[PDB]
Amino acid sequence: RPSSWR
Amino acid sequence: RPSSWR
Amino acid sequence: AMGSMERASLIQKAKLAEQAERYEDMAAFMKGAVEKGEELSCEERNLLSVAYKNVVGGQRAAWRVLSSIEQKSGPEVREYREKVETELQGVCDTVLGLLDSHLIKEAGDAESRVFYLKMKGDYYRYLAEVATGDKKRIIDSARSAYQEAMDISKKEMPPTNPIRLGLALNFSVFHYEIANSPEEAISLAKTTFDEAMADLHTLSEDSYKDSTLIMQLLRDNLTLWT
Amino acid sequence: AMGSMERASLIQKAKLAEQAERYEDMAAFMKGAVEKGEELSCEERNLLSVAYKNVVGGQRAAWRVLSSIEQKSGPEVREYREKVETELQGVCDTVLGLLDSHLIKEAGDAESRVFYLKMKGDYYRYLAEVATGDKKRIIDSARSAYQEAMDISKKEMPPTNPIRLGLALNFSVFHYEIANSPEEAISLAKTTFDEAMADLHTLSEDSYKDSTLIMQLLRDNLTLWT
Ligand SMILES: [Mg+2]
Ligand SMILES: [Mg+2]
Ligand SMILES: [Mg+2]
Ligand SMILES: [Mg+2]
């Protein structure tokens, strides 16, 4: 799972 | 805060 | 709302909800299972307890944050704390209602009856945490439930039994935090710990792990309190 | 349900709900604030985004757990995955509805219009994650929203602007995970990172911290992908 904005 | 059962 | 679902499907979905960390769903599935009117197994009782403990635990944590903000202080913080409070009370009343209709009266074995009376004590304790209005009658209701549970546990269960241990742990917390009885709390935790320690020699490796985990919670409290 | 509460009180309660980690409440408060019909400030937009991202994030995580169990496999796992799926779709449709009625059309400044179009892309992306039935039209809706946002951002915002960065990050994720375009994803992340790096010299210490945080997410993805 890649990072989306958080 | 003390520990209750968990 | 769960009247049309099979009991077994409700239990299966409670387990799935647990894996998914969907505790509101898990509680609703287990409420539905209880309302089928059959007694609950050990595993099922634990699913019921885990579900509601997680739901009410989140409510309690939020209530504490809001109460702290309110203490530091328009009507909004009080209004919202009251909203969360009412929602918490509702969950506690729902659990107590399941215990009263009719889990406790159908529970004859010590393991089930102690489990349910501990739950009854716990949910009155949560009601007591937010009470200001009959705080005393709520506190007495918790005490009575815990006391009945403890009397059965001491007669019917070994001192290492995990439910007996968890009951004593939570009744000690009740004394320390609710009843303003820190000496009773410490006494209870110490006696419980020492009597369990003396009975560990009777256990298997797996039972030993179960009992010593809860003993460590008693110790953690005694460390905090002394 | 929030029609009777003042806008300012809704915003105040959204902040309290955030502090209490009550994200469902926070989302409902912010939905109510949006439905007052006034534009939202920067801070308010962020409250709206945080609320719904936390709600849908929990749903997405649960959906993934259930979908994994279902893949490994009576009707119960599929039924429950479908229940969580429908609830997720409902939240996405609610957000998209707020954006369409009427946040996007009233957003004239680049900061607000890009913010809302990024949100539109994100919520269609979440719909795409669970779609099997018009997956293609959902995917195209996400793409179009992200593309409009990117065209504005490139014209109107510096390459270090945090909303521009977060948009590019999420559009890159869209390419990698949804559109089956890993090369486009990597290209976009790399160009975004490099153009931001070249513009850091213009920033204050605080702005630099903001931009470099999001750049590190672009880098984390490039590390995972290459
Ligand atoms: Mg049946
Ligand atoms: Mg019986
Ligand atoms: Mg007004
Ligand atoms: Mg405008």
Numbering used by the authors:
A (entry chain P), B (entry chain P): 124 to 129
C (entry chain A), D (entry chain A): -3 to 69, 78 to 137, 139 to 231
Q: Can I see the authors' text?
A:
In addition to the pH, the reactivity of the aldehyde functional group is highly influenced by the electrochemical properties of the electrophilic small molecule. To investigate the electro-donating and electro-withdrawing properties of the molecular glue on PPI stabilization a panel of 2-ortho substituted benzaldehydes was used. Structural analysis of X-ray crystal structures of MG2–6 in complex with the 14-3-3σΔC/Pin1 complex showed all molecular glues shared a common binding mode to MG1 with an unambiguous electron density map for the ligand. Analysis of the crystal structure confirmed FC-A binds at the interface of the 14-3-3/Pin1 complex similarly to MG1, however, does not form a covalent bond with 14-3-3. Notably, 14-3-3σΔC, which is C-terminally truncated, was used as this mutant simplifies crystallization and is highly homologous to 14-3-3γ in structure and sequence. However, stabilization was not solely driven by electronegativity, with 2-Cl (MG5) and 2-CF3 (MG6) analogues eliciting less stabilization than 2-Br (MG4). These results showed that 14-3-3/Pin1 stabilization is driven by an interplay of molecular recognition of the composite 14-3-3/Pin1 binding pocket and the reactivity of the aldehyde.
